[PDB]
């Protein structure tokens, strides 16, 4: 699993159930929640109802994610004493 912050190559990872939003074109309305389709059924809705455009909100978003980072010092070579 994944935690936090990892700087890697990955792609966009969510559930079905999980909606995607969307700003329709045509008038102008936007779609969230229970309004917006469901991941899965996406494709199908994309098909007949593709009037709608994906809000670039949301996109953004999951970019995040990646564009933040972390990182740690270097190691170091002995010498002194612990005391």
């Known amino acids: 699993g994944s935690s936090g912050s990892s700087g890697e190559p990955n792609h966009l990872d969510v559930d079905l159930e999980t909606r995607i939003p969307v700003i329709n074109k045509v008038d102008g309305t936007l779609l969230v929640g229970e309004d917006a389709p469901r991941r899965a059924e996406l494709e199908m809705w994309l098909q007949g109802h ?3 455009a994906v809000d ?3 996109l953004a978003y999951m970019e995040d994610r990646r564009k933040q980072k972390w990182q740690r010092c270097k190691k170091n070579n002995s010498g002194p004493s612990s005391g």
Do not use: A, Q, T
């Open 50 to 52: 593709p009037e709608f």
């Open 56 to 58: 670039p909100r949301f």
